Amino acid sequence: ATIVALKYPGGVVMAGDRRSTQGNMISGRDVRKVYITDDYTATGIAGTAAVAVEFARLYAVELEHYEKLEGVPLTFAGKINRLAIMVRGNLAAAMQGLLALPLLAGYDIHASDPQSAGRIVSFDAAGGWNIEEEGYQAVGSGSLFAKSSMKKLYSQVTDGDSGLRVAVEALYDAADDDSATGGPDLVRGIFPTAVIIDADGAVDVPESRIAELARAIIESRS
Amino acid sequence: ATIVALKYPGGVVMAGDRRSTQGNMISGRDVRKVYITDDYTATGIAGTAAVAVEFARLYAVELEHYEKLEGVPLTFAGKINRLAIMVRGNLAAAMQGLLALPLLAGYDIHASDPQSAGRIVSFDAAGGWNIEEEGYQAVGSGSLFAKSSMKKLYSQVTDGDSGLRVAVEALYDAADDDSATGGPDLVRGIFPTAVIIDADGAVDVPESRIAELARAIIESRS
Amino acid sequence: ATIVALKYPGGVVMAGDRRSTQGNMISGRDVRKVYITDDYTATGIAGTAAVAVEFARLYAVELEHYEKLEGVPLTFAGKINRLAIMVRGNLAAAMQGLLALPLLAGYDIHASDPQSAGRIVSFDAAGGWNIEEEGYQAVGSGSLFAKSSMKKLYSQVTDGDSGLRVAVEALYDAADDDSATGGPDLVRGIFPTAVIIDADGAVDVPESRIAELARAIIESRS
Amino acid sequence: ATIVALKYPGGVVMAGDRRSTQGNMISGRDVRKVYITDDYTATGIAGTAAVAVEFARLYAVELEHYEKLEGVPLTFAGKINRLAIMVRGNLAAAMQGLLALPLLAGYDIHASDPQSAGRIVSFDAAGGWNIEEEGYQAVGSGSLFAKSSMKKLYSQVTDGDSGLRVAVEALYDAADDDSATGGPDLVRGIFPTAVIIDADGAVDVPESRIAELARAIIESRS
Amino acid sequence: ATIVALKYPGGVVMAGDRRSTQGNMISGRDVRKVYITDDYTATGIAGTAAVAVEFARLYAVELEHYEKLEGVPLTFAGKINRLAIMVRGNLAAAMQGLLALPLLAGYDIHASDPQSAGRIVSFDAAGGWNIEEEGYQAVGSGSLFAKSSMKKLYSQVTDGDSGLRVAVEALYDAADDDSATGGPDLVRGIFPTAVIIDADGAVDVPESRIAELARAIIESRS
Amino acid sequence: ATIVALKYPGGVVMAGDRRSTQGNMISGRDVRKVYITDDYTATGIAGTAAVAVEFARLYAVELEHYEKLEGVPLTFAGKINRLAIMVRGNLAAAMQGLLALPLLAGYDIHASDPQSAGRIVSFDAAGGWNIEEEGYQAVGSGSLFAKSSMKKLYSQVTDGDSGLRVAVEALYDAADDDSATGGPDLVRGIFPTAVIIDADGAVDVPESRIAELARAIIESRS
Amino acid sequence: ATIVALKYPGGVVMAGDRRSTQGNMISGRDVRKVYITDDYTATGIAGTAAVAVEFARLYAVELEHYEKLEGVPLTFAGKINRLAIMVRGNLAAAMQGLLALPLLAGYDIHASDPQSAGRIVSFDAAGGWNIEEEGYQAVGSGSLFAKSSMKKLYSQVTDGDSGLRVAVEALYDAADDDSATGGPDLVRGIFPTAVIIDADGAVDVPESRIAELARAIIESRS
Amino acid sequence: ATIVALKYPGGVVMAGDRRSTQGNMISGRDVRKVYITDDYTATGIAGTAAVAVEFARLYAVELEHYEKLEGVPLTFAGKINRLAIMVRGNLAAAMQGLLALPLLAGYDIHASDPQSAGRIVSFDAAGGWNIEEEGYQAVGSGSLFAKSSMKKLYSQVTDGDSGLRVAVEALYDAADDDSATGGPDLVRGIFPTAVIIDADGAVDVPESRIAELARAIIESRS
Amino acid sequence: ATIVALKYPGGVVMAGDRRSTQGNMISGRDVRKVYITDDYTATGIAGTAAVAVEFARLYAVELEHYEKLEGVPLTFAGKINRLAIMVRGNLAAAMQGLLALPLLAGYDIHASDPQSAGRIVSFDAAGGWNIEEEGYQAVGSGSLFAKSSMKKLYSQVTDGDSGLRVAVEALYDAADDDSATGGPDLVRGIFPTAVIIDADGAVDVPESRIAELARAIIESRS
C-alpha cells in the first residue's frame, strides 16, 4: 500500500493504490484509501479499507462538529492539532500490531500567497507531525521507491495535470518495486484514486483521466 | 513461486514462473526454475535461481556419473531413490530456514503402455516421496490455486498443446491469487518457461509459443 | 466448516456445511450455521452450533429492538455498523482462542436498481468490514477451495436455481479438499442448508431441492 | 490412518485405509500401508506412503539377507526380535516428531496346532512388543473406534470371509468416527487394501471382493 | 557503505564510497572497498577496510594459484563457482554478526559479442549467486536509493564516460539519503574510487577525473 | 542532534543543528529545535521537531498562565522548578523509549551584576537539574565533541559575535565527528538556528549572519 | 586507560597513562602499557600491566624468531599481518570479557621519503586493522577526549619535542575528562611513559623530560 | 561521593566532596552535598546535586512548618522520626535504581552535658536509623577508606580545628583510594565544603580555611 | 581470611589468620594458610586449609623438580612465570565457584642492592600478576581494612621486629572490621602464623613471639 502527495502551483494532489494483502495472499483489489474530509482537506491511511474509512469518518465528524458548535471552521493549525491528538491516542494499540499512519493534504485559504497555499503533513508512530517543505511525500510499504521516483520527476511539475501525471508514475514505480502495492490492472480496469485540492475545494478525479494517464505511461515504458 | 506438472496422452509437461522475492520486495524477474536433468527427466525447485540450478547440477552429475561407471542408465525407481536420498540429507538445514522441495517429471521408456509412460513425483519436507495418480501436481506458494484451477481444466487435455495451454492458465491463476508468483509481463516480454518430455526426450518449449498462448489467455479473460 | 455466498440477478444465496470437529474427531453431523436475522438479511458464522445461534440471536434482538423503539428499520449501512461494533468488541477473546468471523448477506430495498440490490459483507479479525464486488465470498477452513471453484463456475449463474446449484457444488469441492468440512451424507440423508433472499424476503430452502441438486452433482462427478 | 488385524481359524487378516493428511488438508487418496514382507508375514505402519514402503523394504531386505546367508528362514521369535531392534533404534527421532509404530501379522508354520497358528504383534513407542491374545488389534488415530467395533463383532468370525467382512466393517466405523481415516470412496472407486495369510502363504485380496463387501455394508447401514 | 556497478557498451564500471561507521560515529574517511582481483575482474565488499582487503587478497591468491598450477586461467563460470564456495563457507559467522556480501564485475573474453561481454554477479546471505540482466546493481545500506537513481539515469549511458558519470551520481544520491554512506568531501578532497574493465583489462580511474565529475554534479544540483 | 549554549559578557547564546534521523536514514533536513519560551528564556530539546515544539509550547503556556494570574512573572528559580517538575513527570515514558532532555538558557534581570546575568541549566534523565559554572554546555549525540571543541575555543569569547562564532564552530565539529548531526548544507542553503538573549530580551539570529559565519569557518578549514 | 600516538616529521611518538582500576577502585598507580617490541616498532595495549607485558612479550618473541630463522627482519606489512593474526585469534575470549585492543607505532626504513616513514596502525574487536592517515590516534576509555584535543593541537607539531608536548597535553585532557585515566601525580612523582621512534630506532623517553613538560602544562592551565 | 561526620568536645562537624559521575565520566566538579536544614542540624546525601538539594529542601520545609504551626521546634527524636518516615517512603524507588541514603548531624540543646551534645545519625536502605556512639561516621562509595582513616586519626581531635583537619584528611584518603570521590583541585581552586554546629548554631566553614588545611595536608604527604 | 605481606630493610614478612567459615558458621580455628615453598619464597592463599596446602605442595614440587633436572634453581622471574601459568590454568573452575588467589613473597639473591631484595607479587582472577612497589599488600575478605591500617602504620617499619608488629596489628584491624577473619584467641591460645625471609632464607616465626606481640597490641588498645 502506498499513498503519494505532491504540491503544484495553485494546489495539491494526493493518490493511492488499490491493493490489500494478508501476508502473500491478495485479499482486495478495489480498496479506496484517500477520502475527502472537509471542503479543503483530504486524508490517506496506508492500510485496510475499514481502517481508512473509519479514521476518515471520525475525523470528518470532529471537524464538522466544531464548525457547527462555533459557527466557523478551524484554522489549518487547529486541524493538525486535532489529528495529532487522535493519532497519539493510539500508540499502545499500534505497538500491539494495529498501526495507522495518516497523511494529510490541504489548502490554506488564509495564506497571503495563494499559489503556495498547498500543505502536506506527515505523522510518525509516536504521534509527531511535520509540515513538509520539499514538495512531495509518500507513506506505506513502497514509499521509498515512490519518493526516489518523485525526486527525479518533480522538475516537470508546473500545474495540476503534470502533478497528477507525476503522482501516477510514482505509484507505478512503487508497484514495480514492491509486491504489496498493486499496479494498474488493465484486464479488470481498476486504477488508482486521486483527489485534487485547489482554491475552489477538494474534488475527486474521474477514473477515465487516470486511466488515460496510466495507459500513456505504460506505452512509454514498453 | 509456483511450478506445475501435468500428464497428457504420450508425455508430460512442466512449467514454472519467473519471480523471486525478499519479503515484499521483488528481487528477480527472470528466474529459471525448471531444468532438464537427463534425456527423459526434468526437475523443478520452488526457490531462488541459485538453489534450483545447484540442485539440478548435482542431480545431473550423479545420474551421468552412474551412467558412465555402469554402462547403462538407472531405472526410474533408481532415480527416484537417489533424489530421495539427496532430499532427505537436508532436513536439519531445511528446518534452519533453507528448505528446497523438488518436483520431478519424467518419461519411463521401459513401460509396456507408451501412452501412459509419463510420471510425476513429489517430495515432502521429511524426505518422503509419492508417485501421483490424478494427472497433475503443483509446488510453491501458489500451488493450491494452481491445483484448484487444474482440477476444473484437466478435462480439456487431449495432447501436448492442450496440456501446455492448461499449464500456462494454471500459472496465470496462481499469479492472480498470490503476490509471490509473477504473471506474464507484457511490458518487458517475460513469460514462464516450460519443458515437454515425450518418447523422443525432453525439450525446451520456445518462448514465442508460450507468448502466444499467454496472450490468448489474457484476451480471453478481458 | 465453510459458508459460501453469491449474488445472482435479483437476489443473493448463502449456504453452509453441517460438520463440527474437536481436533480430528467428528463431534457433530447436523450443525446449522446459517440463520435468518431479519426480513432481508442472513448471517453465517463458521464455528460451533452454539456460537452461530447465539451471535445470530443477539444480532436479531438488536435489530428488532431498534425497529420497535424508532418505528422504522435501520438502513443497510446501519446494520453493517452495528454488526461491526459487535465483532470489534470481541478481539481479545478471539486472540484468547475464541474467534468468530461472520459473513453477512442481504437485500437492499432502497437501491435504485432492484436487479443488483443483493449485498455480501465480510469481516476480518480486527473487526474491519468490506462490501464485496466480485459476486461471491466464502469463510471457514475450506474457503480457499470454495472460492477457487466459484471463480470457474460463476459464469453459469443467471438466476436463483443456477446460483443455488453453484453454491452446492462449491461446498462439495471444499469438502473434497478439506477434512473439517463435511460433504453430502447419503447414508444418513443430511445435506447443506441454504437461504435465498430476494425482493420478497429471506426464505429457507427446502431440504429436498438441495438433496436433488447434490445427487445430480454426485452422479455428474461419477 | 488405521490398520486392523484379526485372527480367524486357520489364519490371520490385516487391512488398512487409504488416506494421508497434512493437518486438516487431504494430501493423498490412494496410500497403501500394508505390505507383504515375506512368505508368511505382513507389516502395517500407520503413516505416510513413503514411511510404510521404506520400513517394509528394509525389513524385507533384512529377512531375505538372513535367509540367504544361513540357508534357513528365521523363526517367528527371531523375526520379532529383529523388528523390535529396528523399532527401538528410532526413539529419539520419534520424539523429534517422526514416530512410526508398526503392526505385524504372521503365520507360524512350526506350531503344533495349525488352526491357531496365526499371530499378531504390536509395538509401543519405547520399542516394547506384545503378542496379542484376544484375537484382534488396531493401530492409528481411529484405533479405539475400530477396537470397540471388533469387540462387538468378533463373535461372528468363523473363517476367512467372515474375518475379512468384520475387518472392513471395523475400518468403516473408524472412518465414521475419525476424520483422519478415509472411508470407502464410491465416486472414485477406492477401497481399503487387505492381506490374508494362511498355511499356503500371504496373498493380496483382490479389489472387487473388498468392493462388494463394502457395498453390502453400506446398503446394510442405509 | 554502497558499491554500484553498471554495464556500458564495451565494458563495465564499479565504484564505492569511502565511509566506515561504528554506530553513529564516523570511524573512517578514506576506506577503499573496490579491488582489482585479476586482469579482468574486480570485487567490492560493503564493509570495513580490513574485510574488503582480506577477502580480495584471498580470492586473488586462489585465482593466481590455479593459473600457475594449470597453465591457463579459469573461465568466468569457474571464478563464479570459487567465489560462491568462499561466500557459502561463512554463513554461521555471518549470522554471528560478521556478514560480508560481495559484488563481482568482470569482462568475459571468450564471449562471441565483445560489446556485451561485461558481467555483473551478486550474492545473497545463503551463498546464492545471480548473473544480472538489467545493466546495473548496488549493494550496501544505500543500495535501494542508488538503484532507484540508476533506474532513471540508465538511458543516458552510451560509453565509459557516461557510465562513470551515472555511477558517481548514483553514489551521490545514496549519500544524500542514507547517513552511513559518505558523500564527496570538498574540504578534505576525498572522492569515491572507481574501476573500469574493458577488452584491455581492469584499470583504476584517476582521482582527478572523479573529482571533476563530482564537482560538475554538485554545481548542477545547486 | 546537538544543541550548544555558552555564556559571554552581557548575555547567552544557544544554537542547534537541523537533522532528524530514523536509524541510518535521514528523515528531516530543516528541523528547528531551539524556541523562545518567554521574553528572557529559550529552550532546546535534542529530538524530533514535534517533541521540541510541543514541549516548548506547553512550557510557554505555563509561564504565561502564571504571569496572567499573578500579575508578575516568575523568578528564575521558579521557572527552573516548573521545568524540573515537567521533566520529572516523564521518567517512565522516557525509559519506555521516549526520552526528552531539555537545555535551558536565560537572562536573570534581578541579578546585581548585569554582565554575568546569563544562565545555563541542564537536566538529567531522573529529572535532576544543575546550574552550570564553566560557561558552556551541550546536549545530544554529538555533545561530547562539541564540549571538547568549546573547551579549546572558549578563550576567544569576548562578546556576542565571538560567542556566536564559537557556537557555530562547535556545531561544525560535532557534525564532523557524529553522523546523526547535520553540518552546514551549502547546496540547499540550510544553516543552524541560533538565539541570543541579553538585557533587551531574546531575539532570533538572522540566517545570513549564520551563513556568513559558517562559510568563513569552512574556508578556514579548507 | 589511554594510549596516544602521533606522527611528526621524521618519526612517531607513543605515550600512555599509569592507572589500573577494578570498577571504581584504584588498583595500580605505576602501570606501564607501552613496550618496545623491536628496533623500529612499539606496541600499546589499554588494559592491565600483565596483559600488556604478555602480549608484547609474545609479539617480540615471534618477530625475533622469524629474524633468526630467515636471516632478515620482516617487512612492515608482514609485522602487521602477524599482529592481526594474533589479535584475530582472541575474539571469543574478548566477547567473554577479556578484550585487548592494541595500537602499533613504527618506522618504515624501506620507504622512499624518510620524513614520512612513521606509521600508526589500529585494530578493531573483530581483528581488522587500518593504517591511519590523519597523523594521530588514541585507544582506551579516554580516547575520544584525547582525539578531540589532538585535533585542535596538531597544527603546532613540527618536530619531536612538539609532538611529545602535544601527546602529554592530550593525555592530560583525557585524564581531566575520564576518571579511569590517571593524571600526572605530583605528590608521588609518577608521570606518563613515552617512546620515540626515528631513523635511529626506538628509545624510551627519560622521566625528567616528561616531568618538566607536564609541570609546564599544569602551570599553563592554572 | 563521600560525606564524613565526627564529634568533638562541644559540637560536631560534617564535610563532603564535590564530584559527580556518570559511570567513568566526570559530570560535575562543584557539587554541594551538605546543607543546613535548621538552626542546629545539617544533612548530607551522597548523590547528585539535585537529589541532595531537593531532599534537604523538603526536610527543611517540614521542620519549619511544624515550628510555625505548634510554636515550638521539634525535639531531636521527633526530627529523627520525621526523617526516618521520609527515608522509608522511598524503598521501592530505591530498589528501582534511585537510592538516597542521608547522614544527619545535629546539636541537642536540651541535653544535660553540653560538651557531649553533638549527635550523628545514619540510615540504612530499609529505612532503619542508628545513633552512633564511636564519634565518627561516613557514607558513600569511599566511606570504608574514610572510616579506616578516622579510626587511626581520631585520637588527635580535641576541638573544632582538629576535627575539621581530621575530616579533611579523611576525605583526602577516600579520594586517594576511590575514583568516584574527587580530591582537592589546586588548578581550579575547588575544595570540600564543611559545616560546624555548636551551642551557637550551624555555620558554613569559609573556603579559605579549608584551602589552607588541604594545602598543609598535601605538603605533609609530599 | 586475610594474608598480609610487607617489606622491611633487609627482607620481607608474611602473615595470615586462622579462621575458616561455611557461611556464617565457624568451621575451623587452626587453619594454616602461609607455607614455605623453597629456601627463599613463601606463598599464601586465602581459603580453606586443603586448597592452601595443595597449591603450595604442587608449586614446591614444580620448583624442586626443575632444580633437580637442571642443576640450578630458577630465577625469580621464572618462578613468577610458573606460578602465573598455574593460576591461569584455573579460571573456568574459579568462575565455577572455586577461586584461589595467591600472594607470593620472596627474597632475590641476585639483586645488586641486598637491602631492597625483598619482593611481593600479587595475582588477579584472570591470572595477571603485578610486582608491588608501595611496600605492602593484602589479600582476602579483610584486605581493604588491613591495607588501610598498613597505610598509616608503615612509617614505623625500620627492621624485622617492627615489620612483624605492624603485620600483626594490620591483621588485628582486619579481624576487628570483618567477621570472616579471626582475631587472636586468648582463651584457646591460637595466634596468627608468620614467615620471615631474609638473606639467610625463609624461617617460621615461633608462636610465643607472635603471642607476646598480640598481647601488647591488645593491652595498648584497651
Numbering used by the authors:
A (entry chain O), B (entry chain P), C (entry chain W), D (entry chain V), E (entry chain Q), F (entry chain b), ...: 1 to 222
The article reads:
The Mycobacterium tuberculosis (Mtb) proteasome system selectively degrades damaged or misfolded proteins and is crucial for the pathogen’s survival within the host. Mtb 20S core particle features homoheptameric rings in a conserved α7-β7-β7-α7 configuration. These rings assemble to form three interconnected compartments: two antechambers formed by α7-β7 and a central degradation chamber. Stacked β-rings enclose the degradation chamber where active sites containing the catalytic triad of βT1, βD17, and βK33 proteolyze substrates.
Notably, 20SβT1A has a slightly higher RMSD value of 0.63 Å compared to the 20SOG variant (RMSD 0.22 Å) and the ixazomib-bound 20SWT variant (RMSD 0.35 Å), highlighting subtle structural differences between them. A comparison of Cα RMSD values calculated separately for the α- and β-subunits showed that conformational changes in the β-subunit primarily account for the observed RMSD deviation in the 20SβT1A variant. While the overall arrangement of the catalytic residues within the 20S CP is essentially unchanged, we noticed small but clear differences in the structure of the 20SβT1A variant. Notably, the longitudinal axis of the helix formed by residues βA49-E70, hereafter referred to as switch helix I, shifts by 4 degrees in 20SβT1A compared to all the other 20S variants. This results in the displacement of switch helix I by 4.7 Å, which in turn shifts an upstream β-strand and short loop containing residues βA46, βG47, βT48, and βA49, which form the back of the S1 pocket. The altered position of switch helix I is stabilized through the formation of a new hydrogen bond between the backbone carbonyl of βG47 and Nε of βK33. The helix formed by residues βF76-Q96, hereafter referred to as switch helix II, is unchanged in this structure. Of note, switch helix I shifts by 4.7 Å in the refined atomic model of the 20SβT1A variant, while switch helix II undergoes no structural changes in the consensus map as this represents the average state of the particles in the dataset. In contrast to the βT1A variant structure reported by Li et al., which was crystallized with the β-propeptide present and adopts the canonical state of the 20S, our cryo-EM structure of the 20ST1A variant lacks the β-propeptide, potentially accounting for the observed conformational differences.
